[PDB]
């Protein structure tokens, strides 16, 4: 019956919908096309920041390391790195800007620092995520073409990963806390999962947007009473020039939280 209104909401938006929710309080899950692949767009940046924090566990100085990027690293969507060009930015700051403003230059910088795309994939493999695959740099990874497995994951995989990283034992304590802190300071997420949750709840999320009207959001939610909820929602549409449907992500959140 969740099955139904989601099925319903999907046709209505003439899109494809993947949902994975993990209620950590009772072990319950809601899964919808959750083994299907979906272009992750900026949501991978969550995995990317966790990878940096992993590395930082054997590199005390890595997070304060100052990066002096040139003008040519700048992309269209790089508000924060643009702001700090003259002075540069620390690894930490870059992680923040990539999580909280979805800065694409910050992301590309963080991938170099780590040792390239494959380093991100190896990190995912290391925490038991078999589906996450990063194939292209920013900004080419947002093409989100139908049936293209490049730069995709499954809602289940990403939900499992976010659970491990933010609530479980995949990172060491300080790192794990920092990842949570970055997520809770996100500025891009007002109209998606946040919009579907009660305003007294605590939400930490990473959004992702792309071609084919791709509208994504992965979140951990802290309800006023009880243990936290992991919620991942991926949505994509028929035509390449589709307009985003952030409302759909809010609607899905409402549907899901109504069960619980």
* Method used to determine the 3D structure: X-ray
The answer to whether the annotation marks 208 as part of a ligand binding site is yes
Sheet strands (E) in the chain: 15-23, 28-32, 38-39, 66-67, 89-90, 152-153, 202-210, 214-222, 229-237
* 92 catalytic per annotation: no
Round to whole Å and give the CA distance between 84 and 105: 11
- Output Rg (C-alpha) for the chain, integer angstroms: 17
Cβ distance 218 to 239 under 8 Å? no
**Domain range for 35:** 2-259
Was 116 annotated as part of a binding site? no
Question: Which candidate in 1, 42, 72, 102 is catalytic?
Answer: 42
Phi-psi region of 147 (alpha: psi -120 to 50; beta: other; left: phi over 0): left
CA pair distance 52, 17, nearest whole angstrom: 30
Question: Of the candidates 45, 217, 228, which has an alpha carbon nearest to the alpha carbon of residue 53?
Answer: 45
Q: Which of 213, 199, 254, 211 is nearest to 231 (CA)?
A: 254
State the residue for tokens 């990283």.
165
- Header resolution in angstroms: 2.4
Q: List 206's β-bridge partners, or say none.
A: 218
CA distance 205 to 42: 11
* 3-class DSSP state of 138: coil
Would you tell me how many other CB atoms lie within 10 Å of the CB of residue 55? 18
CATH code: domain of residue 21? 3.40.710.10
Q: Residue 58 burial (CB < 10 Å; 0-12/13-18/19+)?
A: exposed
Please tell me whether 184 is known to bind a ligand: no
- Rounded CA-CA distance 137/124 in Å is 17
- Structural domains counted in the chain: 1
The residues facing 105 across adjacent strands are none
């Amino acid at each position: 019956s969740v099955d139904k209104q989601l099925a319903e909401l999907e046709r209505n938006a003439n899109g494809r919908l993947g949902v994975a929710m993990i209620n950590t309080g009772n072990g319950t899950k809601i899964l919808y096309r959750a083994a299907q692949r979906f272009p992750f767009c900026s949501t991978f940046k969550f995995m990317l920041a966790a990878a940096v924090l992993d590395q930082s566990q054997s590199q005390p100085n890595l997070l304060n390391k100052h990066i002096n990027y040139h003008e040519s690293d700048l992309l269209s969507y790089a508000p924060i790195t643009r702001k700090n060009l003259a002075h540069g930015m620390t690894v930490s700051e870059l992680c923040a800007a990539t999580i909280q403003y979805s800065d694409n230059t910050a992301a590309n910088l963080l991938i170099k620092e780590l040792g390239g795309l494959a380093a991100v994939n190896q990190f995912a493999r290391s925490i038991g995520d078999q589906m996450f695959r990063l194939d292209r740099w920013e900004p080419d990874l947002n093409t989100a073409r139908p049936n293209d497995p490049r730069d995709t994951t499954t809602p289940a995989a990403m939900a499992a990963s976010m659970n491990k990283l933010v609530l479980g034992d995949a990172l060491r304590p300080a790192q794990r806390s920092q990842l949570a802190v970055w997520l809770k300071g996100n500025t891009t997420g007002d109209a998606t999962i946040r919009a579907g949750a009660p305003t007294d709840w605590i939400v930490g999320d990473k959004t992702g947007s792309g071609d084919y009207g791709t509208t994504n959001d992965i979140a951990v939610l802290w309800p006023t009473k009880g243990a936290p909820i992991v919620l991942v929602v991926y949505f994509t549409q028929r035509e390449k020039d589709a307009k985003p449907r952030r409302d759909v992500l809010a609607s899905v959140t409402k549907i899901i939280l109504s069960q619980i």
